[PDB]
Amino acid sequence: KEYEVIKNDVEHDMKADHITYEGLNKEATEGYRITANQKSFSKEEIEALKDQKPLMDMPSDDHKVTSLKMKFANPIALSKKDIEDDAQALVSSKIQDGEKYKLWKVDKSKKEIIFFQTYEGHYIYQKTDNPSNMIGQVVLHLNGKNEVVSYDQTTLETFKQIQKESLITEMDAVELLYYQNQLKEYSTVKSCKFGYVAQYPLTSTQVLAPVWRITVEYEKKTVQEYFTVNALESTILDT
Amino acid sequence: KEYEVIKNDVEHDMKADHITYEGLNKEATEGYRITANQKSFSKEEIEALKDQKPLMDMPSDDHKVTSLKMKFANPIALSKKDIEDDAQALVSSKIQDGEKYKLWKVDKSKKEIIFFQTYEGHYIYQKTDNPSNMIGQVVLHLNGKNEVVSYDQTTLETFKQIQKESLITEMDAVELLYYQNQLKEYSTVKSCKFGYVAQYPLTSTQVLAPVWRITVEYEKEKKTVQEYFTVNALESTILDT
Ligand SMILES: [Cl-]
């Protein structure tokens, strides 16, 4: 074979450029391309949220609500040095479909706690920039003594695995990055974590792709960079 | 640039194995993922076809007709040695949206000529097996002396471009075949033509991705045998940084 000759050429260049790998799988598994619908919240779901007052236009004949901005009637105390667990606990038991979200980031400058919707317990990685690219998140807003005041929410529902495929390994993903010239010399691969990204929208439906999220620290000073590499092996089709 | 190292390794390996190729674009191009709806054939549309009686159930409250199956009152003579042009003429003049379809294969074993629907000049490459894979085709059925007796039709409409992306180069696509151990020693790369394939369904919507349709030929008392490959044209290895 030639995949082999090429692969270990990339090995013998990575060793040349002193690139470090960490506990990475070399055994392929099976994966799926997923399509999910954008949840549309109804009148009856919204008012069914006890002890919570809305901060958005209710739905109607013209208007659909795919984004909840809700205010708690009384703000909820979160522990100082246990903040992360208390935050999960709050999301699970008070927010609709809360079980389905995992904690991403505690941003202290923005005074918020960000949660990503998962699939099979794996992050659906998204941009924490803005509400545009918030397909599936819960963002908790805090004030003062770290009490949650309001939260923003969007949800994916009705998942369909539409296409099965073989997935590239972890090491595969890293070689693929080095190939694309995304690794300077002496650069370390800190982690290689699995999850999804919305590859593109359809009418009212996102199409998810499984990915490896790679975290490299390297020099330019020392910085971490994050790459989202496509886990799907869809190169050759059938004829 | 470390892809430049590896690409030129692959380039040499190919010369080592005597794989010849010519006039292949090394420059990146921009393409689109697209969608289309499966044409649903109304009653009006069906009994607007003159000198044609249907061989399928008419549409109803319960039913919808995405696939025609249509018989000519009097079968139409095709020509002996000019068969292909006579076929294209028939499809365009006598069939709904005929000019959108480009002739694909003449299959004497099944006694049927096959047209594939196109988009912006290119083929929607499909399988020629069952009618399940027949998302956009016209199939002429013949009997006796080259005379068209009937045809089956499926049509795509309402094409939308839903995401523009960078395509991989012609040259890239052939290297990809080699890399994955698909090309035999001493083979010739005859063509790298562009087109689309159905990636998967979604109710009435079909999602279509661009592909390179690479034809290769080699020897096998020598025989010149050909192989056809379809490589996904979309470059989508790195999605975010
Ligand atoms: Cl893809």
Swiss-Prot record, chain A:
Disruption phenotype: Induction of WalR-dependent gene expression. Cell wall defect.
Gene3D superfamilies to which the protein is assigned, alphabetical: YycH protein, domain 3-like
Membrane topology according to the record: Single-pass membrane protein
Disulfide bonds: none
Compartments it resides in: Cell membrane
Segments on the Extracellular face: 1-239
InterPro entries reported in the protein's UniProt record: YycI-like
UniProt keywords, alphabetically: Cell membrane, Membrane, Transmembrane, Transmembrane helix
Gene Ontology cellular-component terms listed: plasma membrane
Subunit structure: Homodimer. Interacts with WalK and YycH.
Record's function text: Together with YycH, regulates the activity of the two-component system WalR/WalK.
Record comment regarding domains: The transmembrane region is required for the regulation of WalK activity.
Designated name of the protein: Two-component system WalR/WalK regulatory protein YycI
Annotated gene: yycI
